[PDB]
Amino acid sequence: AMLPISMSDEGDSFLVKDSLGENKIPKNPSKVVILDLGILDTFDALKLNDKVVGVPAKNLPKYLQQFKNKPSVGGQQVDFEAINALKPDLIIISGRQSKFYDKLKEIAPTLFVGLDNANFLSSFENNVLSVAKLYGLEKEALEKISDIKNEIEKAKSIVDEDKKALIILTNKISAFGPQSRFGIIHDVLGINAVDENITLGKSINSEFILEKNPDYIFVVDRNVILNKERAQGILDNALVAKTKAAQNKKIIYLDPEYWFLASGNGLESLKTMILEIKNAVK
């Protein structure tokens, strides 16, 4: 279980500990470089847009275009020269940039907002509240956290207890299960898994899919972020056509700009993901 972010108020700053280390973070930071797309969406939802001085622009998804003219700090690829030239007072990162921590932390205090795949909602709430604490915005962040909790309960209430889903990432097809990077389908929304026994996932084929006969298949097509080959075609075969999922038109292509980029730290992006699952299975 990932160590949470903890903060103690030391006047004009916080002493902050997270799973990667300790930082002294000034209150109300005014020059923030954000490399996690989810928390960037949370900055927006808390009205902190003007605090942001740098974002991964090569990346930037359709739902974060209010940031497209921020100075770019990379996309996988971090530009440390650009980050240094901004002279930030805070850098914010998530799991994909933990490999860059020591170098980012030479430039400025670096806050990790990791999403624990075994404890998604507690990590999401801690990440959002910790950001908000920096700005004195706890009351606004609690309201919005509540709204997400209410959307989760609405989605959960309509789930068919007797139906099972398979999650896949796509020529390679790989299966994911509970407590994976896509785990919230099973772990938060309570949609049963075809295999509860499954960060790279398990290699599979159309035969595996037919074998399992899922009522739903949730597809995350990583081609879209990169190709001419797409999931609709990898799955366009007579084996996959045999499934309950194909028969009832419940092969559900999820937007990878949410699911693969992993924008679960976002107050509004997480909502959109919940609604996306709910509207597929109701």
Residue numbers in the entry: 22 to 96, 98 to 192, 195 to 222, 226 to 253, 255 to 310
What does the paper say about this structure?
The periplasmic binding protein (PBP) CeuE1 is an important component of the Fe(III) uptake system in Campylobacter jejuni, a commensal Gram-negative bacterium in the avian gut, but a common source of food poisoning in humans. CeuE, an integral part of the CeuBCDE ABC transporter of C. jejuni, is responsible for capturing Fe(III)-siderophore complexes in the periplasm for delivery to their respective inner membrane transporter. C. jejuni does not itself synthesize siderophores, but capitalizes on their secretion by other bacteria, such as E. coli.
All five mutants (Y288F, H227L, H227A, H227L/Y288F, H227A/Y288F) were crystallized in their apo form, and all structures are closely similar to that of wild type CeuE. However while there is clear electron density for the Y288F mutation in its three structures, H227L and H227A are located in a flexible loop region and there is generally no electron density to confirm their presence.
